[PDB]
């Protein structure tokens, strides 16, 4: 969802990228860095917007 | 030798997106201010976008706020025209026109005489 | 708009052979590494068959040593992956994965995260 002209919960509601980009989105994964045994509920989401 | 030339036209889901560009060859397109317009099956030509020479004023048709978004590179000689949220209302040709201020006031709401046109490229929206 | 696509499913006999194809669109699949991954009903996802960018590095899971052939056409914008000598314990459904390599190395032998997923096609080896 993080790419220009897309749409989601996050790419509509969290934050919007517009179709005339110029840059890089780079990603990787943090499983043995963002992840506990009981679970990492320190990152919030929104699901709801006006 | 002055060309106007639509591309990217084609068939879409509604719902859908697609990204239409206006190329010009023979000429600095950057000056002139460009509008993208369209013709419904049995329908007249309405504006749907225009924006300025340097880009710095926009217009758009009610039907399409919130869906279309209009932007020019000047250093590419190219307007951009993309579409979002894709109805079968938009089942049209459409066509980009270069042209200049006839008017007073920096904004392009009005329409004027339209200088230079392209040959138009179809966006059909049916699913 | 970036999809990946398999194909070449079905119902086939044990010690019969069978191929599937996993294509792209949207984007231009020669400089992802390309890797087979399977779940058979009640275990988990398991690598079978990784093959490089280029092609020059492959990997297979043991299991499948001597039955399973990948190859891939940079320029069809396709990676293939041969099935001989298929057993009832190759029934599960069929995934194609695209990626860039998380490490260090050519060889493709380790896993890690897989940018792109398809829908997959199932494979079935009963009789």
């Known amino acids: 969802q993080i790419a220009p002209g897309q749409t989601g919960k996050i790419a509509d509601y969290n934050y919007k990228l517009p179709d005339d980009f110029t840059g890089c989105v780079i990603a990787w994964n943090s499983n043995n860095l963002d992840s506990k045994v009981g679970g990492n509920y320190n990152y919030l989401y929104r699901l709801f917007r006006k | 030798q002055v060309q106007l030339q639509e591309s990217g036209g084609g068939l879409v889901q509604p719902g859908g997106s697609l990204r239409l560009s206006c190329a010009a060859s023979g000429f600095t397109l950057d000056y002139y201010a460009i509008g993208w317009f369209r013709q419904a099956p049995g329908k007249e030509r309405e504006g749907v976008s225009c924006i300025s020479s340097s880009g710095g004023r926009t217009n758009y048709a009610d039907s399409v706020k919130g869906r279309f978004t209009i932007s020019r590179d000047n250093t590419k000689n190219t307007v951009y025209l993309q579409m979002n949220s894709l109805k079968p209302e938009d089942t049209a040709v459409?066509?980009?026109?270069?042209?200049?201020?006839?008017?007073?006031?920096?904004?392009?709401?009005?329409?004027?005489?339209?200088?230079?046109?392209?040959?138009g490229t179809q966006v059909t929206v049916s699913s | 708009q970036v999809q990946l696509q398999e194909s070449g499913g079905g119902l086939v006999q044990p010690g019969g052979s069978l191929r599937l194809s996993c294509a792209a669109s949207g984007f231009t699949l020669d400089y992802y590494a390309i890797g087979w991954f399977r779940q058979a009903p009640g275990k988990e996802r398991e690598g079978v068959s990784c093959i490089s960018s280029s092609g020059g590095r492959t990997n297979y899971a043991d299991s499948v040593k001597g039955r399973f052939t990948i190859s891939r056409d940079n320029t069809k914008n396709t990676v293939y992956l041969q099935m001989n000598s298929l057993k009832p314990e190759d029934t599960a459904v069929y995934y194609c994965?695209?990626?860039?390599?998380?490490?260090?190395?050519?060889?493709?032998?380790?896993?890690?995260?897989?940018?792109?997923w398809g829908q997959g096609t199932q494979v079935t080896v009963s009789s």
């Open positions: 994965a695209a990626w860039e390599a998380s490490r260090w190395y050519c060889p493709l032998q380790f896993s890690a995260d897989f940018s792109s």
